[PDB]
Structures are given as structure tokens and as C-alpha cells.
Amino acid sequence: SLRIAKEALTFDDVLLVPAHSTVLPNTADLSTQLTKTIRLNIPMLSAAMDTVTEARLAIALAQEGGIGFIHKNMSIERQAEEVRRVKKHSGGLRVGAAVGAGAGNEERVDALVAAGVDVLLIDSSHGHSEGVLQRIRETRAKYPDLQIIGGNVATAAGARALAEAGCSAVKVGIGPGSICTTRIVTGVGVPQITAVADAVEALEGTGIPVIADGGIRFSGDIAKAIAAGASAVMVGSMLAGTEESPGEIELYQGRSYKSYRGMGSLGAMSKLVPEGIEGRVAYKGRLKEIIHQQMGGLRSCMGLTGCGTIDELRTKAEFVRISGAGIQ
Amino acid sequence: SLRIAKEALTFDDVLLVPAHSTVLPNTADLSTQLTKTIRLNIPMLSAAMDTVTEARLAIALAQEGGIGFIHKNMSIERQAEEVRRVKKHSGGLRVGAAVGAGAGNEERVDALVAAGVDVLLIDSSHGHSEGVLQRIRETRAKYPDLQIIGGNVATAAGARALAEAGCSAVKVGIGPGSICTTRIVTGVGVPQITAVADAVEALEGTGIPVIADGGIRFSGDIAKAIAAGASAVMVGSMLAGTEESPGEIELYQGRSYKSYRGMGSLGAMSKLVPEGIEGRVAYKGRLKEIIHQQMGGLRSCMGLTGCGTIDELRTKAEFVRISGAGIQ
Amino acid sequence: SLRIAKEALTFDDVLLVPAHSTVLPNTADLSTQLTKTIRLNIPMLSAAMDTVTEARLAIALAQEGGIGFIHKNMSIERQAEEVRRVKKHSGGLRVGAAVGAGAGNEERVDALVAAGVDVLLIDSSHGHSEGVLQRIRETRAKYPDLQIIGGNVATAAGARALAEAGCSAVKVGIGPGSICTTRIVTGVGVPQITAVADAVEALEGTGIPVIADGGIRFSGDIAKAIAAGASAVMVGSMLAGTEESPGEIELYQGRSYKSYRGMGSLGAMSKLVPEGIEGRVAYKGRLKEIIHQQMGGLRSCMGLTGCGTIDELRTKAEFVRISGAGIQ
Amino acid sequence: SLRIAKEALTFDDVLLVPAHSTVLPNTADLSTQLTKTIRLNIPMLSAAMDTVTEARLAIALAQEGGIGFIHKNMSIERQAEEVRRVKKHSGGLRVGAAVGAGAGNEERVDALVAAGVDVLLIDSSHGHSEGVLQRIRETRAKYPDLQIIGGNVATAAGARALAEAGCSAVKVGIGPGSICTTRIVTGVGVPQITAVADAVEALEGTGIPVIADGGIRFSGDIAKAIAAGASAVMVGSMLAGTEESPGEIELYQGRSYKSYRGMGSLGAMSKLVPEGIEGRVAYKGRLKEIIHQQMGGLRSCMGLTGCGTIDELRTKAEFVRISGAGIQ
Ligand SMILES: C[C@H](Nc1ccc2ncc(CO)cc2c1)C(=O)Nc1ccc(Cl)c(N(C)C)c1
Ligand SMILES: C[C@H](Nc1ccc2ncc(CO)cc2c1)C(=O)Nc1ccc(Cl)c(N(C)C)c1
Ligand SMILES: C[C@H](Nc1ccc2ncc(CO)cc2c1)C(=O)Nc1ccc(Cl)c(N(C)C)c1
Ligand SMILES: C[C@H](Nc1ccc2ncc(CO)cc2c1)C(=O)Nc1ccc(Cl)c(N(C)C)c1
Ligand SMILES: O=c1[nH]cnc2c1ncn2[C@@H]1O[C@H](COP(=O)(O)O)[C@@H](O)[C@H]1O
Ligand SMILES: O=c1[nH]cnc2c1ncn2[C@@H]1O[C@H](COP(=O)(O)O)[C@@H](O)[C@H]1O
Ligand SMILES: O=c1[nH]cnc2c1ncn2[C@@H]1O[C@H](COP(=O)(O)O)[C@@H](O)[C@H]1O
Ligand SMILES: O=c1[nH]cnc2c1ncn2[C@@H]1O[C@H](COP(=O)(O)O)[C@@H](O)[C@H]1O
């Protein structure tokens, strides 16, 4: 007899059920509480990846009503500088910045708080690690009002641990990333739809929102992640290759590409075995057109489910479980 | 814990069980009640699509014992004209015409009723939308005897809503269309076999028939949709590319093709994000040969299940659930 | 709610469980009762197909300890002649011959019985059809000692019907054939492993053996069909393309091929829509080498399961159910 | 009704659950008890295959903290010589050697014990065969202290049989090998994750460790096999093509390859039908780099699950069951 805790579902395992609706897709309210104090106009966070979010992308997404997360794969001074560029920009834009859970990050957090960061992201592949929880407790004691997102977890016990450590928001995702090889390398992972619903159920009545991070391929996946209980989603692949993302555009056969790699790739690493792949992603153009298309998809879902707000989608919308023949 | 209402099955998930039979495939009765007043000789409806049904196809299918649905992607006057061409044609052929649920369709319904339409199709991607139900209630009050089909729904609550609004027949199908991207864009959908059986169970004892719309690839799918409880099926892909369908025949490498696109495709649309693809379908030839082949398949099923009539197939025939290995 | 009788399994859904064994693969007894009076040395029957069994193949398989079934796609006189060639051949070989269930087959049965046929196969795509059962009852009354195999069925009720009609053996298989399109055309079919076990359970205590017909791709499938309860298997694809099979060998790119088609293919038919495909199968060489390889596989299974006889394999060997990941 | 003992899971069916952790991947203890008297530094055994383990590979793996198994596809004198080369080498390296269960192996066991073998592997495709169990009982009586591994089994009854016969360790694996065709040829097999957990549950409280043999493709599979209860894993494919493995390196299109075949392949055999394939595997380079990468994967798992030792991973780590959509 094997120690199987439960069956766990991914995005492709389920579909949302259409319901009675007075909701017009164009009248749908996409605003969401990222934390008890931070409200975003769209439920979109950009990944803290060296091929996804630097100041230029963080600015564009904030303009669309989301929030960007400056990656930790640069010097403390260079990151605080990226935070200042987003913060100093006209329009009163909000920004986030990622920090490691390792020793010698107290200095980085200090520089980011001074640079005006709205939300500190304690960025770990294992949020339930005691060293991540200690770092959170240390940051919360020093900065009692700082908005902190901690992750990543994929269990109810993991979400509770982060909430007890002082997290303002909990990030969910162990193995779902499009560039992730954690599942194959370590054998560990939790299918995202179950991971999100478990974390949300654990955090019921706490006012601590859940972020569904990784595995979002289509706008239907955004809707599913929210109906599973996530207040917002974090995307890497969806925003990689856009004009606003870091790095230069490459020309291969005549088609335009941009780099996209996991933060656990050999390339991004330069002592652990890699948990991410390095690849090319087709050039997507301007972030504005991508967000318009993806949010439109979500809007159309809200019309089909009769959910006029993110909160209604999170708590009212129902799913049906489908087979492999259902999927194809 | 996720809000999973139930498991939902598609055509590939099931197979019909052979049973004791005195039914010869050639003696099988294919007639069905589309509504309490309209009886078709074959259980086949053509899709209200701009690449499937105009007067020429509607005439050919009516001649085979089915019914065509003139699409709403043309002016009010041009549609009433298409209705008159089918109606005025010799042989006393029946015709249907699709109308949108939006404002400024009262004028279209008036012109179609005057042009002699036998069945008005209130054509929506979301039949459970309050604005669709209101339009149905408005049409039923003005025309107490007009045959109205409303859709699309995929739940028991959705079928009941349409029946209460005054529908003569309920159309089922949320996401099963061969050209549909609703499932990927919105994340909403119900596998067709479950959607049909739920709607039929809801409408038991009402005399309001269910139309299984979308996803029919083979004649076996027609049989499955009927045994799931549908009185008839609606097909797009199956009749696209036929000589009688609208548009011109294209030559690519030496092979003959015709256009086939969703009514929610960018092309068909010209404010929502697209929910349909634009594609080429191989030229199928004359509609008569397709119907003979597809109905022959259904006839052979009726012989194997011991169901001599559509009503027997709808209520007696049993299924077995199969795995993915069952499918392949 | 859908009328789902049960879940049904195919060969790929299961695996046999290894067990304590005193059985050496080389000492395994492959003999089986085809009927209460006919005992075969190997549990192998060749398909009654115009691309599989004529006198030459029927002779070779009988020599290996199996039995061939001369197909009904030839004149009454020409079939009786094929029966005489196998019967008159030295060695006291047993032969079978297939007859249709249609009117004007009384003459064919008379000629086959006179020609010395050991087993009459009443060959139908639907054994549960009243016209098949009547034909069996008519043959049993006229020939009280004639060995009759009737089929095909795939249910417990279907197996009982054939046994009550007077069948000496029941043939199982609705939709499993490698060249079969019945499932796609009609939507009817029962996954073979469940179909066989249902028929065997129905016929428990009757002494009427079950033949698993269709879908056997590998020697492991033979073992699975027998452990599901079949006393023997019927193969088409496995023996198609052999030197002994009818038709000439074709040369395509340099590789040798032979024709293999369903008896319900357009080609084999020349009033029903086709339920079979027409294809080329690679030349397999001599039947002797194929049987040695396939029976060796079965022998090895008998060693792994601790089943020294066909009867032990049929009644003792256990299965495990596997997922799609189990299969690949 | 089919004799289905249970549902059985393979590596791809499950994922390990992340948990609270004070474990740093670099501080993780990989040591394991292969037997009550033999402790390995890494839980890795090399396959007793003629394309995987001879003295050179056995030396390299022992140096990494594992143990190699010299294959039985060579003369008694030539195998004892291979055992002496590993044993006589500097560093006090441990070695294993495989023997068949057939008659005329008493001579081979005598020569291997004299040559200084640390662990005798009674190597069979069917550990539950009475002739394998007798050979074990004969060896245990003659050598009361000799470390004996017997296999392969895949059931609780099979593991108990080997433990009762006197085995120091039980090897599990019926059909999971990357080069195995037993499942297709015989129809027998047990998905590895269930096979391992069943054998471990059977052997609870006996101090007799289980070896998970076959099917390990990635480092995540090692972790899964251990959490299923295996004390160690046996790998063929993972070490085939390495510089230390037997045979010469071949050049095909410009890429370097090495031979990899099942011990039941036609080639390795030269009276049974083959149960293995013959193939080329890409040249992997030095064994040291492969082990560093694979153990790193395991180390990372130990950090994610909060299991600081092999024993903790074997008994504390939990799984989630995933769908086919979960897998892809
Ligand atoms: C190589 C890998 N790289 C990454 C980097 C970013 C990631 N971001 C998200 C996820 C989600 O599965 C995994 C990630 C893996 C990684 O950090 N492994 C890893 C494995 C086990 C432990 Cl205990 C730790 N402790 C927390 C430092 C790290
Ligand atoms: C773009 C799309 N296009 C279509 C067009 C024809 C269709 N026909 C059938 C189906 C069935 O899923 C979907 C279809 C989508 C479409 O209408 N989306 C859509 C999504 C949500 C709502 Cl609330 C509405 N309200 C009813 C106007 C429309
Ligand atoms: C076209 C087809 N052809 C065949 C021919 C050989 C077959 N042999 C076996 C099987 C097993 O599914 C199907 C076969 C279909 C065929 O006979 N259909 C078919 C379908 C329904 C009925 Cl009621 C009948 N009645 C018995 C004459 C025949
Ligand atoms: C041809 C085959 N070859 C091998 C060789 C190595 C293997 N090693 C492991 C496994 C695990 O399924 C299968 C293997 C098959 C093989 O031994 N078959 C086989 C089948 C049934 C029995 Cl009763 C026996 N008795 C034990 C001698 C052998
Ligand atoms: O190398 C890596 N391994 C595993 N997960 C990663 C890696 N790098 C980033 N991630 C995660 O993958 C997410 C992006 O997933 P995507 O949106 O599916 O591409 C990020 O937000 C991280 O949570
Ligand atoms: O763009 C679209 N999106 C979704 N469904 C569509 C679209 N256009 C038409 N449909 C549906 O798809 C059906 C045709 O499906 P088919 O027979 O599987 O090709 C139509 O009768 C409509 O119900
Ligand atoms: O056209 C056909 N349709 C369906 N089944 C067929 C047809 N012709 C033969 N069969 C069946 O298929 C079996 C051969 O299956 P195979 O061994 O999997 O190739 C025959 O013994 C018949 O029972
Ligand atoms: O021909 C064969 N048939 C079946 N299993 C085999 C054969 N040769 C070796 N094996 C098994 O396959 C294992 C290697 O599996 P791998 O690590 O998945 O490649 C060996 O340790 C044996 O247990």
C-alpha cells in the first residue's frame, strides 16, 4: 500500500460550467485584492524571471492594471535602481521585487524598501523550507507594514505556514511552470488546480489571497485558476518574448524570437542540479495587445459563468471533471 | 476542495451496447419530432453558419428529410429573401432562420415570420444569458404559435430556463464544435454526451425535444447523441465543403477545398475576443451522398441495438464507458 | 443521467499477475476444448475472411494444432470444394466453414455438411439478431450432432441467446477487429476483455466454450483473452500476409505485401454502409514460424502465471488494471 | 466479471508531495542498507546485463558508493576473474555477481564465493518460480552468511516466498525495463510503483530490503521508487552507453553510441521466445558525472520532502495520484 494523499487535478482535467448570467463580458469587473491593502485592476502578475520582468515590463503591466516583479538575478544596487525607475515613472505605478531566502539578502530587502518597493516577494522553489519561513518572520518583524508575498507552496500545510510566518499573500506552484523540470528531476509536484484549491481552503477567513503561479498557457487557464480560488495569477511564458521583456530580439529563419528560461536553468544559475530549461519563444509584440486578448478571454468566461467580479468567479463558478478524450 | 459538480463524458468516452434485434437496418424509421408540431424524416439539422447554410444547402437537406438554418451573417432583407427561395421552391420544403439575441433583431424576426419561416432559431453562444431568455419570452408573446429553438445550453438548469421562456426545442452544446475555441479562450465547456443527457433529463415529460449541436465527426457520434436523448443533431463540419454549401471551391495543390470557420472567428466577426478558428475543409461533393452514408451508419446502429425508431434509440439503447485505451 | 451499463476494458487496460509456478514454459499444455466434442492442440482459429482463410491456410493451421474457417465470399460449390481439399488431405485434419445468416444459405450448409465440415460457423456481425438465432435453431434441428459456432456477441444476454439457440461454441467480438470501423460507423462496440468475461460468466456450467475474436495484436493479447475466460482465440491480422493465406504477394518499394481487408469493406462487399477498411499487410512468411512465436509467448505466460493448462489460465490467472501511463 | 486483483500504478501515475523541510539538499544522507550487513553510500545498483556491468563499471560505481553486478553471460572462470579484478582493486570495493537458476550453476556460485563476491544475485525473470526458490534454499544452506539477492518478483506473495527461501534482499520488477517486451510477449507485468509498495508492505518488520529494478528513466523515478519503499534502485538504461560499461563505442552519423539490449534479446540469448529488444544508446561519458546528476536530483527531492535520510524518504514522503493530463 502506497502513501497516496489524494488525486490531484491540473488545468486540462477540468472545465467551467456555464450558468445563468446577467453579466455582459464588457461590464465585467476584473479588479482584485492582491493583499488586504493592494488592489490591482487586472488579476495579472509578471514572473520574477531574468527573461520576463525588469523595469520596462513592470511599467507596461502596471499601466494595464497588473503588477511586475523585478527578478533577483542582478546586483542589489542594480535592482534598487530598477525599482526606482518604475516608482519614479509618472502615473503612480506599483512595483514588486524578488529576494532569495539565503543569507545575505537582508541588505537587498533594505535597499528595495528604501527604493520604494510596494511588495516584497520572498522567492523560493520551496516555501515550506524552514529557512524561507525564518526569512519571512525576520522581514515581518523589521517591516510590520511591508506587503510580503511568500512562496512557492502547493499544500494546505504550506499555505498555513507562510500565513503564520506573516505573508500578506501566498504564491502557489510546485512543478507547473512551462519551463519547469522539477517534476522530472526531483519527482515532486502538485497539479495546479488542486494545489490552488487546497491553499485557498487552508486560508479561508484569513483575508490572505492566493496567487496561482505557473502553467497558465491560455486565457481559459486564468479563469480556471481564479475559479479554483486564486485572487490573481503569475505568468512567465505568456509575457516572455514581448517587446517590454528584457533581452534582445533574435532572428532565426526569418521569424523573430526572444530568450525564455527557468531561473533554475544552467544558464540562469551561472550548488544544485538544474530544474529548468533554456529556450527560444516567438516574439509576441506589445504587452498591451496580449493583456487585451487574455483579459477578453477572462471577460467572456465571466459572461458565461454569470460572475460579474473576480470574487464571484473565485467563489460561485463550478467545474466538471473531464477524461483524456474530454481534453483532445 | 474544488467545486466539481460531476464528471462529464464526451462521444469518445462511450460505446453503444449491441442488443437483441428484430430490426433490419433498411426497415429502420429515422423520423423524429423536432418540435411537437414539426416532424423531420431524418434527425439532421444544418448549422446556422456563413460557411454552411444558405438557401441552396437548406433546400438539399430539406429534400433529404432534414432542415437547414439560414445564418444571421447577412442583411435582414437578404435573409428573408433566402427564406423565400427555400419556401417558394417546389415540394413544400421547411426552413429555419437564425437571429441574434441583441437589440435590433425584432425587425429581423418580423421579416423572417412574413417570409414564411417554419422555425425561428434564437442563436446564442450562451442560452442561459438573461438577454437571450428575454428575447425568447418577447418572441413567444408576439408569436404564440411560432416554432422557436433556443440555445445553446449544456446544463439541466439551462434547458429548464429555455423551456420556461417558451422554446419549442432546446439546443445543447457549449464548447463541442470542431471549429470551437471557447474551451481554450474562456475555460468553459461541458462534454457533449453529459450535456445532452442532463438537458433531456431536465425536460422529461415536457414534450420539448433536445438538439445535440457540435462535435459530430462520424455517424457513430449521431447514434451516441440520440441514445444520450437528443431528438436530432446539428452539424457544421459534416456539411461544410459540400457543393450546396455557400462560398466558392478553392484549388490548393490539386485537391478541391471550401472555407469552414466558426461564427466567432475574426473573419466571421468582421466586441469580443474570437472563440472560433478559420480553416479549409476538403470538398465533399453532393450533400445527398453524405446524408446517405451518415444515415446508413445510424441505420446499422439501429439494427445492432434493436431500436426500430428514433424514440427507441433515445430511450432503450445502453452505453459502456471506455478508457483512453478503449478509444485508440 | 446517461444509461451507462458499466465500464468496459480492452487488452491494453490490463496485465496478468505473475504467480508461484512449477510450470516450465516448454512443458505447458496448449490443448483446449473448442466444443464438447472438438479438442484442438493449440487455442488458435483463423478468421473466416477472403484475405485470410482458404484451403491452403486451413491445412497449415490444422497441422499446427489449430483450425481454419473457410470464408463465405465464394460460390457454394467452390466452398464445398475448399472443404473437401482440407478434409481429403492426409493426416485427418479438421476444418470449419462460414455461412451467412441470410435466406438462401440452407443450400450452402447442406453442401458443407456433405463435403465433411467438422464445424459450421454461422458468421454474423450481429449474433443477437433474431434472424441469426432462427438460422441456428433451424440448423440444430436438421443436424442434431453438427458442431455449430455462432456469433458475434459481446454481452452476457447475447452469449445466453446463442447457447439457447443450440450453439456448440459462442464467438465474442463486437468492434475489436484491427480492420473494423463498426465503432466509428455505428457507435456500437464492447471492449474485448469485458465482452469475453461477460460471455464466459453467462455460460458458466454449460460446457459451451467462448472464442475471443478480433483485436489480438500480440501474443500477450492471446494470454489475456484466455485468462478473461476464452477457450480459444480467432485471428485475422496475425495470419494475414502469410504464404498460406489467399491472394498474391505484391512488391511496393522493395518490400513484400499481401491484401488484408474487412469482410464489411467496400471491396469485400462487391445493402449496407461499409464497416471495414481495405489495406496492405507486410508479408509474414510461413504460418509455422508465426504460430511457433505466438504460442511461445503464451507458453512463457503460462510459466509466469503458474498455469500448466489452458483451463488453469482461463480460471486461475489474475489481472491488474493499468492507467494510460501504465500502457505506454 | 474479470479476476482484477487491483489497480496498479507506474512512476508517471504519481508525484511526491512537498513538505515542511529543515533538510538542505547538500546535507542529505544518501546511505542505505542493501542487506542487514551491507550498507551502500548511494542507493544505486548497476544491472546484471552484458551491455552494462563488467569489472570496469562495477569498480567506478563502487567508487561512487553504489554496487555493480557482473552479468552471467560469460564462462564461470571469466566471471570469477571479473569478481577478482573488482575485489583486488585498491580501496576495499564491494562487488556482486549474477547466477542463473538453472542446473549447473552450483559450480558458478562456488567459483564466485571463492573469488570473494560480497553479494550473490540469483538472477531470474521469475523469482516466484519453484526452481528459483529451491536454488536460493540450496545456496543459503551451503553458505549461511552469504548475502543473497533473489528476484524478480512483483507481488506481496512473491516477496514473502523469496524472504522465506533465505534472501538477504528482494528485487522487484516484472515488465518495467526500458528494453523489456515481457508485457507484450506474455501479457504479464505489474506497474512498478505498486509492485514495489506491495513487496515492501509484505516484508515489513523483516529487515529484508527491496530493490526497485527497471523503468528508472529520470532522477525523479529514483525518488519515487524509494518513497514507494525501495531501499535502493537497479538501473540498466541509466548506465548503458557510459565509458565504463562493456563493449566498444560506435560512430553513426557523427554521434557516439553504445549497445544496449535486454538479457532476453535474440542477440543476448545466443529455449524461449525473446522478451527483450536490441538497440543503440547515445554515449553518456563518465559514470561519475551521471551519478552526480542523478543523486543531485534525489538530494533536491530530499530537500523538497523534508526527508534527510533514505529511511525517511522510504517511510514519510507522500504521493498524489495524477491523470494523463497531469503527466504531459
Ligand atoms: C534548482 C532549483 N531551481 C529553481 C528555481 C526557481 C524555481 N521556481 C519555482 C519552482 C516551482 O516548482 C521551482 C524552481 C526551481 C531549486 O531551487 N531547487 C531546490 C530544490 C530543493 C530545495 Cl530544498 C531548494 N532550496 C529551497 C534551496 C531548492
Ligand atoms: C466570441 C463568441 N462567438 C461565438 C459565436 C458562435 C458560437 N456558437 C456556439 C458556441 C457554443 O460554445 C459558441 C459560440 C461563440 C461569443 O459569442 N462569446 C460570448 C461569450 C460570453 C457571452 Cl456572455 C456572450 N454573450 C451571450 C453575447 C458571448
Ligand atoms: C456492413 C457490416 N459488415 C461486417 C462484416 C463482417 C463483420 N464481422 C465482425 C464484426 C464485429 O463487429 C462486424 C462485421 C461487419 C455489417 O454486417 N453490418 C450490420 C450492421 C447491423 C446489422 Cl443488424 C447487420 N445485420 C446482422 C445484417 C449487419
Ligand atoms: C525470455 C525471457 N528473458 C528474460 C531475461 C531477463 C529478464 N530480466 C528481467 C525480467 C523482468 O520482467 C524479464 C527478463 C526476461 C525469460 O527468461 N522468460 C521466462 C518466461 C517464463 C519463465 Cl517461467 C521463465 N523461467 C523462469 C525460466 C523465463
Ligand atoms: O527553473 C525553474 N524551475 C521551475 N520552476 C521555475 C523555474 N523558473 C521559474 N519557475 C516558475 O515558473 C513560473 C513561470 O511559469 P509559466 O508561466 O508557466 O511559464 C515562475 O513564475 C516560477 O514560479
Ligand atoms: O466560433 C465558434 N465558436 C464556438 N462554437 C461555434 C462557433 N461557430 C459555430 N459554433 C458551433 O459549432 C457548431 C458546429 O459544430 P461541428 O458540427 O462540430 O463543426 C455550430 O452549430 C455552433 O453551435
Ligand atoms: O469489415 C469488418 N468489420 C468489422 N469486423 C470485421 C470485419 N471483417 C472481419 N471482421 C472481424 O474481425 C476479425 C479479425 O480481427 P483481427 O484479428 O483483429 O484482425 C474477424 O474474425 C471478424 O470477426
Ligand atoms: O530482455 C529482457 N527482458 C525483460 N527485462 C529485462 C531484460 N533484460 C534485462 N531486463 C531487466 O531490465 C532491467 C533494466 O531496466 P532499465 O533500467 O529500465 O533499462 C534489468 O535490471 C533487468 O531486471
JSON list of C-alpha atoms in Angstrom, two decimals, chain B residues 185-243:
[
{"chain": "B", "resi": 185, "resn": "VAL", "atom": "CA", "xyz": [-10.35, 31.03, -24.54]},
{"chain": "B", "resi": 186, "resn": "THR", "atom": "CA", "xyz": [-12.88, 31.03, -21.67]},
{"chain": "B", "resi": 187, "resn": "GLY", "atom": "CA", "xyz": [-12.18, 27.70, -19.91]},
{"chain": "B", "resi": 188, "resn": "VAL", "atom": "CA", "xyz": [-15.95, 26.93, -20.06]},
{"chain": "B", "resi": 189, "resn": "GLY", "atom": "CA", "xyz": [-17.42, 23.80, -21.67]},
{"chain": "B", "resi": 190, "resn": "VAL", "atom": "CA", "xyz": [-19.39, 20.67, -21.00]},
{"chain": "B", "resi": 191, "resn": "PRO", "atom": "CA", "xyz": [-18.51, 17.32, -22.74]},
{"chain": "B", "resi": 192, "resn": "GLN", "atom": "CA", "xyz": [-21.48, 16.73, -25.14]},
{"chain": "B", "resi": 193, "resn": "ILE", "atom": "CA", "xyz": [-22.75, 13.33, -24.10]},
{"chain": "B", "resi": 194, "resn": "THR", "atom": "CA", "xyz": [-23.27, 14.52, -20.47]},
{"chain": "B", "resi": 195, "resn": "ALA", "atom": "CA", "xyz": [-24.59, 17.92, -21.61]},
{"chain": "B", "resi": 196, "resn": "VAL", "atom": "CA", "xyz": [-27.25, 16.24, -23.81]},
{"chain": "B", "resi": 197, "resn": "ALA", "atom": "CA", "xyz": [-28.32, 13.68, -21.16]},
{"chain": "B", "resi": 198, "resn": "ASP", "atom": "CA", "xyz": [-28.60, 16.39, -18.47]},
{"chain": "B", "resi": 199, "resn": "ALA", "atom": "CA", "xyz": [-30.77, 18.62, -20.69]},
{"chain": "B", "resi": 200, "resn": "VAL", "atom": "CA", "xyz": [-33.03, 15.66, -21.72]},
{"chain": "B", "resi": 201, "resn": "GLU", "atom": "CA", "xyz": [-33.46, 14.51, -18.09]},
{"chain": "B", "resi": 202, "resn": "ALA", "atom": "CA", "xyz": [-34.42, 18.15, -17.15]},
{"chain": "B", "resi": 203, "resn": "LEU", "atom": "CA", "xyz": [-37.01, 18.26, -19.99]},
{"chain": "B", "resi": 204, "resn": "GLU", "atom": "CA", "xyz": [-38.53, 14.79, -19.29]},
{"chain": "B", "resi": 205, "resn": "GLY", "atom": "CA", "xyz": [-42.36, 14.90, -19.65]},
{"chain": "B", "resi": 206, "resn": "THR", "atom": "CA", "xyz": [-42.40, 18.36, -21.31]},
{"chain": "B", "resi": 207, "resn": "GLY", "atom": "CA", "xyz": [-42.53, 17.24, -24.95]},
{"chain": "B", "resi": 208, "resn": "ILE", "atom": "CA", "xyz": [-39.69, 19.75, -25.66]},
{"chain": "B", "resi": 209, "resn": "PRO", "atom": "CA", "xyz": [-37.03, 17.99, -27.80]},
{"chain": "B", "resi": 210, "resn": "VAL", "atom": "CA", "xyz": [-33.25, 18.46, -27.41]},
{"chain": "B", "resi": 211, "resn": "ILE", "atom": "CA", "xyz": [-30.91, 19.12, -30.39]},
{"chain": "B", "resi": 212, "resn": "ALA", "atom": "CA", "xyz": [-27.28, 17.88, -29.93]},
{"chain": "B", "resi": 213, "resn": "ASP", "atom": "CA", "xyz": [-25.20, 20.64, -31.56]},
{"chain": "B", "resi": 214, "resn": "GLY", "atom": "CA", "xyz": [-21.49, 20.37, -32.33]},
{"chain": "B", "resi": 215, "resn": "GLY", "atom": "CA", "xyz": [-18.76, 17.76, -32.11]},
{"chain": "B", "resi": 216, "resn": "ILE", "atom": "CA", "xyz": [-20.39, 15.20, -34.51]},
{"chain": "B", "resi": 217, "resn": "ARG", "atom": "CA", "xyz": [-17.43, 13.82, -36.56]},
{"chain": "B", "resi": 218, "resn": "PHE", "atom": "CA", "xyz": [-18.70, 10.37, -37.55]},
{"chain": "B", "resi": 219, "resn": "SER", "atom": "CA", "xyz": [-22.11, 8.65, -37.98]},
{"chain": "B", "resi": 220, "resn": "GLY", "atom": "CA", "xyz": [-21.41, 6.79, -34.70]},
{"chain": "B", "resi": 221, "resn": "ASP", "atom": "CA", "xyz": [-21.46, 10.22, -32.91]},
{"chain": "B", "resi": 222, "resn": "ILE", "atom": "CA", "xyz": [-25.04, 10.81, -34.33]},
{"chain": "B", "resi": 223, "resn": "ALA", "atom": "CA", "xyz": [-26.20, 7.48, -32.82]},
{"chain": "B", "resi": 224, "resn": "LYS", "atom": "CA", "xyz": [-24.49, 8.29, -29.47]},
{"chain": "B", "resi": 225, "resn": "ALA", "atom": "CA", "xyz": [-26.07, 11.79, -29.33]},
{"chain": "B", "resi": 226, "resn": "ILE", "atom": "CA", "xyz": [-29.54, 10.28, -29.95]},
{"chain": "B", "resi": 227, "resn": "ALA", "atom": "CA", "xyz": [-29.11, 7.45, -27.41]},
{"chain": "B", "resi": 228, "resn": "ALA", "atom": "CA", "xyz": [-27.97, 10.24, -24.93]},
{"chain": "B", "resi": 229, "resn": "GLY", "atom": "CA", "xyz": [-31.54, 11.57, -25.51]},
{"chain": "B", "resi": 230, "resn": "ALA", "atom": "CA", "xyz": [-31.29, 14.08, -28.41]},
{"chain": "B", "resi": 231, "resn": "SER", "atom": "CA", "xyz": [-34.23, 14.01, -30.85]},
{"chain": "B", "resi": 232, "resn": "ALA", "atom": "CA", "xyz": [-31.96, 15.38, -33.57]},
{"chain": "B", "resi": 233, "resn": "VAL", "atom": "CA", "xyz": [-28.41, 16.59, -34.23]},
{"chain": "B", "resi": 234, "resn": "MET", "atom": "CA", "xyz": [-27.00, 19.81, -35.68]},
{"chain": "B", "resi": 235, "resn": "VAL", "atom": "CA", "xyz": [-23.93, 19.53, -37.93]},
{"chain": "B", "resi": 236, "resn": "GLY", "atom": "CA", "xyz": [-21.47, 22.09, -39.30]},
{"chain": "B", "resi": 237, "resn": "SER", "atom": "CA", "xyz": [-18.23, 20.27, -40.21]},
{"chain": "B", "resi": 238, "resn": "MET", "atom": "CA", "xyz": [-20.17, 17.25, -41.69]},
{"chain": "B", "resi": 239, "resn": "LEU", "atom": "CA", "xyz": [-21.88, 19.51, -44.32]},
{"chain": "B", "resi": 240, "resn": "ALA", "atom": "CA", "xyz": [-19.12, 22.13, -44.78]},
{"chain": "B", "resi": 241, "resn": "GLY", "atom": "CA", "xyz": [-17.31, 21.72, -48.12]},
{"chain": "B", "resi": 242, "resn": "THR", "atom": "CA", "xyz": [-20.37, 20.18, -49.86]},
{"chain": "B", "resi": 243, "resn": "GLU", "atom": "CA", "xyz": [-21.41, 21.54, -53.30]}
]
